[PDB]
Design a protein around this ligand. Structure first.
Ligand code: BX7
Ligand code: BX7
Lengths: 643, 12, 636, 14
């Protein structure tokens, strides 16, 4: 009620300090009386006293020995002081659960990918420890996945809330409860465990539940069953999308899902074979644990395609060769291995086919391995979902206002992440186009170094046989020096065919030097005009508005909790409702007019510039190979200049 | 949408 | 069913509990516009009484109400409180509090971060100037009355506030003192007194401490304080009595604990030393102060990192400034001359055109800098930080003491934690630089071998002229004479070129990936991002911070209830446990590995400059051969 | 460790 204490001989807690209200028990924040440390206390209701206590504490001992991260620690079983009944002393996770985590508006459309992999890593490692200690757990939900801050800062998710007549005189209606007790037991077949796990993973990935009838999954109790027991093999989500219209299946993550394409490629097949009605084609734990832990042991290399203007996470094993790296890059970019040029920190990147992934250059999302083709490729862009504000109910409703506020915060929150990615795409494009231009400079500079090596061996052979005409026709027979000879006069005209046709190699190579020059025809002048920039501060401008909308939303929650407001406080709440819509719209249209429009203008100026640069690299290649054709042409003619 | 009356100084 | 906690005007109301400020003449409350609900700060003069008739300070307020400038907090209206008729000024509410509450955070115990500092400097100077333009200055600018607003773009906007706008033969000898003489020697000091306060504020913002301290705190020792600010040598900006009643330690530089860039310190220390000067002349004037500071603010900043000193650098340069002064500015901090500065940007070498404007330099950030290295030998300096240790935590239960103790401790672990982060940057940058330098030398190698082979197909081709089956059986005029001396040099040129290739290969085997200049120490020694050392520290710093914030609350209560007392006593042990763990982690893991990486880079640098000398000698050797063969190429 | 004075937390206050 208020200022009420329960205690054991070793802990105490306030009934008001309640963390968790379940049907069988309640959990409280408590302290160890002598040290002051914080523990959670699980105290059981009056209806949890319906199975013997000899086998109830049999369950609890076998749990008190479970020692493992990803499992909340059970420290002791003690007895309350005044009343005498059993309480569990557990590990206190002050950060709450994955449920409170998904309840934030930042995770309104799914967790960020780095955190998802942790939920995945930790939930799978928890189940495995439970399966190994002979414990089934089918109630795995965000509600009872706890979150702890590990001492390195990254989250650690931990599992919890798991356990360890005479027939011939019966009325035929009551005889049906004497045959559906052993026969209606459509026995579970051990693959039931990971249906929850699969729903949880979809929830954490997308911010929404996988199977949803319109009006909610709970208001429409019946259409729910039609969806679960009718989902095609491989389908991942079923949504009504209509007041009462047909249901819409899909085996893909929603567009709103921001996880990398690489990861969805790994993740969808897992969920597809984890959500399955029969035991035969549905996965077993041996296969689930083996297939998932394969995703966990992969490292991530960030590559960015300049031709496409698209980022890519490459999920690859530490022991995989450079060959599989190229394949994985092809699977996302449609650029074949023999067409992949890698650029890293300004210089090209050669992969020796024996090189292992662990020895690759370290990458971050903002320091990626760029990949470009010499062939033509159309720019794709960042594929995101176009989300706009919900309609604002003019009713003064404290429940409805808090819900509308959560939604608006989550939409502006999404626009704010997207706008951030749009700036990275533009900033990475600029970082890459800059280097690509400098690599065509190395390619041009190499061609000139070879040309000025062949132009001087061509010359030392021409004046080497022309100076024998200075002795054959000037000092001896003195006649017209024009009549042709047999053997050498055919290789003399063949050399003049090289020296003169190479003169027009310079006139075209000089043109490509000029268009590749700084103020030239291929300058990256669009890159410094056509986008948004870090100095525009569009992200933090949005953030500033999102902070106001968020501050209102948190308040509208406290208003809902207070259930009904005083007079001045009601007018402020009403005033702040208009303020919230003002800020949201100010943000959403700024997302449209400043972030998106200037990004699209930049995306299109890069498709123009991309065609231009590909053409030039094709010309410079055509000229480079002529220098090797003139290289071998003088190779067979030079040793003939022996005398 | 509306109904936002001005603030008052008799809390009653 | 009771009132007396709600004041109002005809247009605003406020709760006497929502008090934002207290002062001798008035208080400031957070209030609302009755018709719109918007928040304003309302300042209510409950003791307006002074030596100043109300008509003087009322014409003041009408003057301030016209002010409209981004660094003044707007005075919207002058109103009368509904029931007491007290004058109330309603004005713009800055929910972020003041520069005082900012400098009170433990993360600013040792000065503001540079970016924020520049903002305070810009806006304080901006408001100050707008005041002069309207014929007001107060000499009373201090953090207490500089408000902070979050701008549309999320950057702070500081705003000035709380400034005004405008017998005898029958008396004792001790009354004749002050009645006709001593209260008459008020020399109405002006013009230069104003800046002293702004100087102390900027020092305080920049270091997190006050510039003049008599060991007992400026207030508890009233006397020594006056002895400091009146005997301060010209050019000094801080005087501190280090020990109990010791001499005063004068200094004219920032303290090591000051995280401000060496570039900005060089600009700031002058405008402090000339602002904190206690005479009519020798001190600066407004017009010079505004121009001199305006010079710092109109400067852009280019980031450069010295691979050989292992130090980062901010270069405060004008956009119209020429590349030649960029080198000057790098010389001032690096002590390496302009003819010695090789510049590297994004994997490639940078060419300072000697005349290009800084406006057109490549964009840089603290982590994407321009690197600088020379061919000459340089000793690694590393980050200069101050080594700050946890204070002594005394074991008594004292609510005032423990609050003061937790604040100090939180501050030390922020400095530790921030310093730990910079150490990681210097290593991550160092590695990016070494990697890039090694590839540049590979370009200087490939450039040399490209001309070595370019010249051998001239030696072997011009030897095939004067030394083939064409040149040179009894003969006496068949060329065996003065041309045979050139064939001799050309033979010793082709043979000496032999051992050029032998030494040229030897350096390729050290530039190779496995060779004895491979940057293998770089990925073994020192700390890495994957080590998560900063966020490890951060996790402890959050425990410590949460406790300090609760110990503030306890101090406020002055007396803790029974259980709370005991929890507070346990949290004080937790606080000391977290802090000593964070501190020893900073020492034995961040610093210890950083220094190991530092010494491994000094050793690897010696090997690098020794190879670059050699490769150079081989390059010059080829231009020599090109020179000496381009002479004999032209024969007759 | 050095900090002292810590008493056990109580439920009953007479
Ligand atoms: O476990 C349950 N319910 C969910 C959690 C309570 N359980 C535990 N909690 C903690 N520490 C902790 C810290 C901060 C906040 C929270 N609370 C939440 O995050 N909530 C409340 C409901 C969903 C979101 C918990 N330690 C151990 C346990 I066992 C139960 C279901 C049936 C009985 S209990
Ligand atoms: O002006 C004064 N005092 C300066 C401060 C209050 N004044 C103003 N405050 C605001 N908004 C605001 C918001 C949040 C917190 C705070 N307060 C602080 O952070 N404080 C209090 C003093 C040092 C630490 C202020 N708008 C306008 C003014 I005018 C005076 C107090 C008594 C006479 S004058």
């Amino acid at each position: 009620l208020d200022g009420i204490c329960q205690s054991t001989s070793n802990h105490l807690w306030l009934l008001s300090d309640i963390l968790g209200q379940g049907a069988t028990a309640n959990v409280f924040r408590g302290r160890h009386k002598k040290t002051g440390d914080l523990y959670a206390v699980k105290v059981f209701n009056n209806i949890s006293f319906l199975r013997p206590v000899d086998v109830q504490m049999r369950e609890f001992e076998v749990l008190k020995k479970l020692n493992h991260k990803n499992i909340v620690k059970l420290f002791a079983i003690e007895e309350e002081t005044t009343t005498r009944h059993k309480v569990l002393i557990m590990e206190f996770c002050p950060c709450g659960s994955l449920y409170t985590v998904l309840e934030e508006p930042s995770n309104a459309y799914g967790l960020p990918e780095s955190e998802f992999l942790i939920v995945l890593r930790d939930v799978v490692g928890g189940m495995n420890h439970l399966r190994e200690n002979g414990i089934v757990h089918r109630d795995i939900k965000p509600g009872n996945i706890m979150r702890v801050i590990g001492e390195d800062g990254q989250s650690v998710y931990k599992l919890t809330d798991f356990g360890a007549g005479t027939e011939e005189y019966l009325h035929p209606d009551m005889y049906e409860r004497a045959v559906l007790r052993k026969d209606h037991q459509k026995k579970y077949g051990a693959t039931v465990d990971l249906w929850s796990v699969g729903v949880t993973f979809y929830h954490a990935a997308t911010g929404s539940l996988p199977f949803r009838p319109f009006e909610g999954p709970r208001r429409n109790k019946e259409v729910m069953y039609k969806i679960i027991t009718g989902k095609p093999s491989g389908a991942i989500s079923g949504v009504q999308k209509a007041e009462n219209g047909p249901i819409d299946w899909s085996g893909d993550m929603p567009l709103s899902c921001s996880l990398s394409q690489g990861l969805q490629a790994l993740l969808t097949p897992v969920l597809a074979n984890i959500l399955e009605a029969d035991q035969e084609k549905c996965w077993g734990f041996d296969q689930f644990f083996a297939e998932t832990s394969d995703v966990l042991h992969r490292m991530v290399i960030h590559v960015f395609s300049l031709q496409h203007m698209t980022a890519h996470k490459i999920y690859i094993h530490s022991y995989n060769t450079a060959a599989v790296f190229h394949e994985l890059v092809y699977k996302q970019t449609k650029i074949v291995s023999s067409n992949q040029e890698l650029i890293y920190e300004g210089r090209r990147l050669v992969l020796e086919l024996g090189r292992l992934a662990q020895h690759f250059p370290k990458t971050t999302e903002e320091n990626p391995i760029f990949v470009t083709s010499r062939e033509q490729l159309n720019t794709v862009g960042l594929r995101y979902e176009k989300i706009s504000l919900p309609k604002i109910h003019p009713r003064y409703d404290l429940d409805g206002d808090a819900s509308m506020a959560k939604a608006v915060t989550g939409v502006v929150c999404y626009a704010c992440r997207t706008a951030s990615t749009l700036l990275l795409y533009q900033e990475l494009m600029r970082k890459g186009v800059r280097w690509l231009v400098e690599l065509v400079k190395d390619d041009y500079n190499e061609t000139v170094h070879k040309k000025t090596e062949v132009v001087i061996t061509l010359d030392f052979c021409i004046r080497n046989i022309e100076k024998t005409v200075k002795v054959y026709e000037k000092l001896m027979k003195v006649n017209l020096e024009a009549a042709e000879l047999g053997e050498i006069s055919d290789i003399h005209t063949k050399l003049l065919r090289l020296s003169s046709s190479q003169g027009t190699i310079e006139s075209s190579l000089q043109d490509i030097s000029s268009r590749l020059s700084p103020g030239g025809l291929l300058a990256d002048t669009w890159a410094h005009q056509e986008g948004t920039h870090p100095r525009d501060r569009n992200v933090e401008k949005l953030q500033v508005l999102l902070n106001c909308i968020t501050e209102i939303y948190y308040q509208f929650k406290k208003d809902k909790a207070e259930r009904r407001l005083a007079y001045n406080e009601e007018q402020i709440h009403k005033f702040d409702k208009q303020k919230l819509y003002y800020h949201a719209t100010k943000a959403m249209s700024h997302f449209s007019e400043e972030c998106v429009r200037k990004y699209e203008a930049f995306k299109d100026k890069s498709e123009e510039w991309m065609r231009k640069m590909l053409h030039l690299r094709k010309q410079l290649l055509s000229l480079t190979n002529q220098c090797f054709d003139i290289e071998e042409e003088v190779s067979k003619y030079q040793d003939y200049t022996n005398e | 949408m509306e109904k936002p009356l001005p603030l008052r100084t008799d809390f009653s």
